[PDB]
Amino acid sequence: RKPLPRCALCLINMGTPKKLAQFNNWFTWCHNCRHGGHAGHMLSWFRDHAECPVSACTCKCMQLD
Amino acid sequence: FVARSIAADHKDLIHDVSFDFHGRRMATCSSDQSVKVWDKSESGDWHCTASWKTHSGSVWRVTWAHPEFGQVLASCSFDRTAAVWEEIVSHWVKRTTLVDSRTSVTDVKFAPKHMGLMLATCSADGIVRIYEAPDVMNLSQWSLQHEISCKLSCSCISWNPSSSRAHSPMIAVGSDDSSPNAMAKVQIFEYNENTRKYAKAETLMTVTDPVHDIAFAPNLGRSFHILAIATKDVRIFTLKPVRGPTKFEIHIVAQFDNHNSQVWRVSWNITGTVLASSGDDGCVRLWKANYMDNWKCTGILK
Amino acid sequence: VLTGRTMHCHLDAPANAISVCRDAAQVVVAGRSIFKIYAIEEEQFVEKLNLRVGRKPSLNLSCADVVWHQMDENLLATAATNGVVVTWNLGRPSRNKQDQLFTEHKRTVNKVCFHPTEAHVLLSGSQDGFMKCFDLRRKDSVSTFSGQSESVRDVQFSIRDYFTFASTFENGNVQLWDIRRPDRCERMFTAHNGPVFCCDWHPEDRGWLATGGRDKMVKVWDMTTHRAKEMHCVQTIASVARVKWRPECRHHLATCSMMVDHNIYVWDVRRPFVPAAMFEEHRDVTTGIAWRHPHDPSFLLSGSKDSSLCQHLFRDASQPVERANPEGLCYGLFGDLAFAAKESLVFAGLASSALSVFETGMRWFVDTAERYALAGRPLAELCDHNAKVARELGRNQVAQTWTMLRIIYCSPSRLPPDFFGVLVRDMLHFYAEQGDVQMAVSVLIVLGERVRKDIDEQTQEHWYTSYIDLLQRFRLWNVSNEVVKLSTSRAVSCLNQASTTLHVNCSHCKRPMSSRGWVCDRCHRCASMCAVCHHVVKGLFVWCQGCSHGGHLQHIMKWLEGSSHCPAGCGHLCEYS
Numbered sequence: 028r029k030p031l032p033r034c035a036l037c038l039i040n041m042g043t044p045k046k047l048a049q050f051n052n053w054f055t056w057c058h059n060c061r062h063g064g065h066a067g068h069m070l071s072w073f074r075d076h077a078e079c080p081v082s083a084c085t086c087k088c089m090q091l092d
Numbered sequence: 093f094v095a096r097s098i099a100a101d102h103k104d105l106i107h108d109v110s111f112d113f114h115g116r117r118m119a120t121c122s123s124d125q126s127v128k129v130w131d132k133s134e135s136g137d138w139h140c141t142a143s144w145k146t147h148s149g150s151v152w153r154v155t156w157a158h159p160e161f162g163q164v165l166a167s168c169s170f171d172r173t174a175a176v177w178e179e180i181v182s183h184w185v186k187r188t189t190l191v192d193s194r195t196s197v198t199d200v201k202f203a204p205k206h207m208g209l210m211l212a213t214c215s216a217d218g219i220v221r222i223y224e225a226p227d228v229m230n231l232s233q234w235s236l237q238h239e240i241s242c243k244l245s246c247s248c249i250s251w252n253p254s255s256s257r258a259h260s261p262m263i264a265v266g267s268d269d270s271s272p273n274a275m276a277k278v279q280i281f282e283y284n285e286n287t288r289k290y291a292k293a294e295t296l297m298t299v300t301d302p303v304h305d306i307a308f309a310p311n312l313g314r315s316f317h318i319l320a321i322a323t324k325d326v327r328i329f330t331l332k333p334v335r336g337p338t339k340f341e342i343h344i345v346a347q348f349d350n351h352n353s354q355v356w357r358v359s360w361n362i363t364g365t366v367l368a369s370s371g372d373d374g375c376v377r378l379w380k381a382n383y384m385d386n387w388k389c390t391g392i393l394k
Numbered sequence: 395v396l397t398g399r400t401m402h403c404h405l406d407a408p409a410n411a412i413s414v415c416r417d418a419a420q421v422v423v424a425g426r427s428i429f430k431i432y433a434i435e436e437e438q439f440v441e442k443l444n445l446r447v448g449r450k451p452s453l454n455l456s457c458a459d460v461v462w463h464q465m466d467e468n469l470l471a472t473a474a475t476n477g478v479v480v481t482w483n484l485g486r487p488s489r490n491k492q493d494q495l496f497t498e499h500k501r502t503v504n505k506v507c508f509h510p511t512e513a514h515v516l517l518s519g520s521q522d523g524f525m526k527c528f529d530l531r532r533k534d535s536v537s538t539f540s541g542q543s544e545s546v547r548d549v550q551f552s553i554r555d556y557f558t559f560a561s562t563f564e565n566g567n568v569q570l571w572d573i574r575r576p577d578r579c580e581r582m583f584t585a586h587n588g589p590v591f592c593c594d595w596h597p598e599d600r601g602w603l604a605t606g607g608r609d610k611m612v613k614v615w616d617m618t619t620h621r622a623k624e625m626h627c628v629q630t631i632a633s634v635a636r637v638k639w640r641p642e643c644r645h646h647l648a649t650c651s652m653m654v655d656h657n658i659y660v661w662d663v664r665r666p667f668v669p670a671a672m673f674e675e676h677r678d679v680t681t682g683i684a685w686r687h688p689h690d691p692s693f694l695l696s697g698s699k700d701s702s703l704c705q706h707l708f709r710d711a712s713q714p715v716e717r718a719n720p721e722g723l724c725y726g727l728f729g730d731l732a733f734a735a736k737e738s739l740v741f742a743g744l745a746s747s748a749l750s751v752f753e754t755g756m757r758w759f760v761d762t763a764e765r766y767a768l769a770g771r772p773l774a775e776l777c778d779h780n781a782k783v784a785r786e787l788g789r790n791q792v793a794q795t796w797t798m799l800r801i802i803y804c805s806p807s808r809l810p811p812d813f814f815g816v817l818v819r820d821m822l823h824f825y826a827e828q829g830d831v832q833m834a835v836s837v838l839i840v841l842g843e844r845v846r847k848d849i850d851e852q853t854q855e856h857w858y859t860s861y862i863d864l865l866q867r868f869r870l871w872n873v874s875n876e877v878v879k880l881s882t883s884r885a886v887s888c889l890n891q892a893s894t895t896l897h898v899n900c901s902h903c904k905r906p907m908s909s910r911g912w913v914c915d916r917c918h919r920c921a922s923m924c925a926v927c928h929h930v931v932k933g934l935f936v937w938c939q940g941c942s943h944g945g946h947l948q949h950i951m952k953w954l955e956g957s958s959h960c961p962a963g964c965g966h967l968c969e970y971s
């Protein structure tokens with residue numbers, strides 16, 4: 028009964044329980060730097076930019092793959 | 093403006109309506125001991141997606157919370173209790189119950205997010221309380237730190253939403269007892285970080301009539317605080333800091349009596365520039381200002 | 395009619411019951427450790443004759459219920475805890491006015507009753523739950539009655555009838571009896587979810603019976619029809635002990651509580667959610683309440699455990715109805731303004747309201763947020779782009795502001811260098827005062843070190859936090875994170891570095907993998923593989939919390955749009971339905 032990591036964009040902690048669990052609330056993390064976020068938010072952010080949302084990062088966590 | 097009347101379907105008078113943080117949901121309470129939650133769709137239809145009995149007496153107010161702590165609500169009622177409700181993965185479950193109250197409970201309001209999950213409650217005997225919840229993931233454990241008495245009988249409370257570091261937490265309370273006396277009816281309580289105790293800061297002694305509702309104004313970058321008080325006429329004050337409890341510089345900026353009745357409720361907008369009053373004539377006015385600090389009118393909307 | 399004023403007097407011991415005469419001048423009060431009578435006076439009530447004669451206490455001294463006979467003023471009845479019923483004859487010259495002593499009951503006797511017309515009928519029950527009847531002709535009074543339930547609480551005669559009375563039982567059922575047929579039951583039903591503490595009849599109607607329970611409920615029952623029915627449902631803030639009905643008012647009731655609550659409440663059936671009248675004179679628990687006159691709704695008689703007897707007048711009630719705010723208000727983010735008010739201000743025509751969301755204003759905020767340029771170009775083009783963004787929206791002063799900044803700081807026997815700094819600072823402060831925290835932050839970010847060394851550090855945090863909160867209200871996430879990335883203050887930057895790094899594992903060996911790399915240190919396997927493309931995932935990696943299967947962000951999103959099955963083939967309905 029202790030919090031899980033929080034999204035880097037919406038700043039609200041993750042979690043998952045007629046779709047009771049939509050795709051946009053699934054976990055996601057860059058495998059090279061391990062900076063997580065939601066699904067919808069990250070798919071939104073990584074369209075106009077190319078850099079990790081968390082500050083002081085240098086990874087380009089879409090162009091790697 | 094335009095009207096979009098909605099069938100609330102309440103057997104008793106509606107006593108409060110409150111909006112959520114994002115502005116998409118809605119909460120209503122009534123003397124029929126029921127609280128309803130309304131959602132809206134892309135088609136602009138307000139439909140109720142929740143209804144349940146919450147107390148054993150008339151329910152006065154209901155307020156929302158920041159959605160960083162989840163979907164949390166609060167309530168106050170005539171049966172001398174206050175409860176906190178939670179939405180879970182879809183009905184609402186009672187999480188706690190505040191019982192320590194000699195007389196009826198009038199108002200309950202939350203606190204700004206930057207200082208945690210706090211609750212303030214006022215009663216009809218004179219005492220006001222401030223609770224807390226140290227673990228934000230265990231909402232069935234509330235502690236009681238402060239307990240302030242304010243002589244007269246309380247009827248309304250309001251926090252200060254200022255998030256500046258230089259502004260100390262401060263809460264203002266006003267009475268609504270109409271006796272043949274002439275005492276002050278609005279008081280301000282600050283909080284000194286050293287003694288770790290709330291204390292009186294200033295009192296507006298120019299108010300000798302009952303007060304029904306008070307409401308601060310969102311700060312959003314200003315260097316002073318603006319307060320609105322609802323009485324036989326609508327009043328607006330301004331307090332500035334100068335340079336122990338802080339001593340302000342109290343002024344006045346408005347005194348309007350375009351209602352020919354007694355004002356009941358006041359409220360501000362999101363930015364903090366337009367007020368919205370409501371009296372016994374059923375007319376909701378709005379009051380803006382100009383660059384010459386003269387407060388004008390902008391609506392007779394009814 | 396009866397005349398007087400509200401007044402109180404102090405007794406010596408707490409009282410548990412009270413009774414009054416038909417003359418409405420002397421009140422008789424009984425208790426566990428007190429027994430006396432008082433004569434009511436318009437100036438001040440005075441005692442008439444106490445019943446505590448003789449220093450020797452008895453098992454019948456602790457009287458729980460007292461009743462004044464409705465036929466003769468010389469007869470009084472007492473119910474004791476020792477299962478003994480002691481009648482009193484006021485005409486006896488001796489101080490001990492006892493007339494008949496009777497001790498059939500073993501448990502504590504709860505209630506007693508007098509026949510409205512007959513002068514020799516008394517009906518009492520004990521805590522033993524067996525119902526027993528009485529005769530005052532000194533004949534064979536033994537007609538005891540089979541309750542067949544828990545302990546009896548209250549029994550009252552029907553004034554309209556002659557041989558019918560009510561009986562309530564702690565099991566949760568109310569049984570209506572008859573006295574001509576002592577063999578079989580007439581009427582039985584379940585009234586409350588728990589014990590029933592009172593039951594009264596209608597002084598005018600012949601088919602109205604209201605019973606109160608421990609579940610904070612008072613309901614009215616009708617016996618006219620062949621089936622019992624309920625019309626009224628009045629909710630109280632505490633349990634109800636006994637109910638008295640207002641004479642000459644068919645739609646008024648009076649109730650009192652026994653724990654927690656101490657006030658006296660008056661209710662109307664047509665308004666089952668709000669009280670008609672209520673008094674706060676008493677301090678302790680109100681215990682014995684009765685109407686002074688069977689036709690005068692003016693004066694009320696009441697008593698409590700605080701050893702005092704008080705009288706109240708109807709016009710002196712404190713009215714909460716006259717101190718209730720009838721309307722509500724609330725603003726909104728988009729500009730809407732809900733508003734509800736009493737119907738009459740916009741038997742009774744004012745028992746409702748009408749929600750009315752007065753819709754139709756801040757589209758200049760999100761539009762400017764979505765296209766402002768803050769980094770990625772040198773200063774001149776950044777200023778020009780924002781000037782155009784302001785221009786098309788119609789805001790001119792902002793456009794000249796941006797253009798003057800471009801002029802003020804780009805591409806200059808000249809002006810002194812630090813000439814315009816004060817004006818820049820004042821412009822920022824002025825923009826902050828009006829509440830336009832959107833332009834201040836943008837100018838701060840665009841300029842940077844050329845202005846960051848002139849504004850106090852506690853003000854910048856205020857501006858940044860207010861702007862971020864406003865943006866998060868409208869759900870503009872990318873812009874908010876963009877601000878958090880290039881904030882000028884260290885406090886704002888470290889906002890997104892608070893528990894935003896995950897730790898991963900390897901489901902084969904359960905060991906935790908290191909930070910950089912895609913191979914396992916023990917299995918020598920590739921723990922990250924796409925369930926669809928069967929390649930190595932080095933970048934983003936989606937996941938599921940029901941079966942721990944996932945892969946590339948776009949592959950799973952594309953496949954799962956059509957099918958609702960886990961790609962790995964584990965028969966799990968990922969993302970339910």
Ligand SMILES: [Zn+2]
Pocket residue numbers: 034035036037038039064065068
């Ligand atoms: Zn998110």
Ligand SMILES: [Zn+2]
Pocket residue numbers: 057058059060061062079086087088
């Ligand atoms: Zn990375």
Ligand SMILES: [Zn+2]
Pocket residue numbers: 057060061062079080081084085086
């Ligand atoms: Zn990263």
Ligand SMILES: [Zn+2]
Pocket residue numbers: 900901902903904905914915916917918
């Ligand atoms: Zn392994």
Ligand SMILES: [Zn+2]
Pocket residue numbers: 924925926927928929945946949
């Ligand atoms: Zn793949």
Ligand SMILES: [Zn+2]
Pocket residue numbers: 941942943960961962963964965966
């Ligand atoms: Zn699976």
Ligand SMILES: [Zn+2]
Pocket residue numbers: 938939940941942943960966967968969
């Ligand atoms: Zn799954």
